Design a protein around this ligand. Structure first.
Ligand code: HEC
Ligand code: HEC
Lengths: 108, 108
């Protein structure tokens, strides 16, 4: 792609420290500040049911792939301006790889 | 995305007339001139097992999404130069939509 696989273990601790505060990755896990992410890849932005998204996320109609996900994670707000996800971004490529490796695997 | 849904019925006849000659979309369908495509989306180019791909397809490490698929279908050779898929391309956006709608659905 324009993405390479990292440590899913490493990625798993990146999440707790960075995503957990607003997210769940488990099938049957609840939405929180952020929506649960089970089954995110191959699915389009704004479709989890029971979640209240911004007009922003919906309209982007992002199709979430490992690659798409990397750019978003760099600067969500730049990528989807008007998004209410308050995360600054994963400046570091190695960080993101790890993370998407993590997601890739547990959102399944 | 940068892709919109079309007629899966229409798409199904585009395939027979344009893809069929070298492909199968069914789980348990055989590779032919081209590889069977069951489960193509979310999977990377060159991974069907038992298929002999060019050095080209492999190296691109394309992650196949509805979107990726559109660009490829326009001009495979431009997109993955050195690819041995002998198809000229689907110049027409509406044609491709239909097709990916079709694939989207039956490669599942
Ligand atoms: C709260 C402080 C958050 C943190 C930390 C992270 N995210 Fe988030 N995320 C949050 C919100 C409020 C939303 C909804 C956006 C909207 O505008 O409605 C999101 C959304 C996402 C998405 C898109 C959801 C979809 O389209 O289904 C993804 C892929 C996502 N969040 C992932 C994610 C990761 C991996 C995080 C840690 C790096 C992360 N977010 C942090 C809120 C919060
Ligand atoms: C024979 C004349 C073909 C026709 C008509 C179409 N395709 Fe094809 N396809 C063909 C070959 C020989 C290959 C392998 C490429 C290589 O370099 O090894 C392919 C490959 C594809 C792929 C990529 C396969 C993968 O990475 O798993 C896709 C997505 C694909 N073909 C789709 C496709 C469609 C939808 C077609 C009709 C428009 C089509 N191809 C025509 C051979 C032939």
């Amino acid at each position: 792609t324009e993405f390479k696989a990292g440590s899913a273990k490493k990625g798993a601790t990146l999440f707790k420290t960075r995503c957990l505060q607003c997210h769940t990755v488990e099938k049957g896990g609840p939405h929180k500040v952020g929506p649960n992410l089970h089954g995110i890849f191959g699915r389009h932005s704004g479709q989890a049911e029971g979640y209240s998204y911004t007009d922003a996320n919906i309209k982007k109609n992002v199709l979430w792939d490992e690659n798409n996900m990397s750019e978003y994670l760099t600067n969500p707000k730049k990528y989807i301006p008007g998004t209410k996800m308050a995360y600054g971004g994963a400046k570091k490529e190695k960080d993101r790889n790890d993370l998407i490796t993590y997601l890739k695997k547990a959102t399944e």
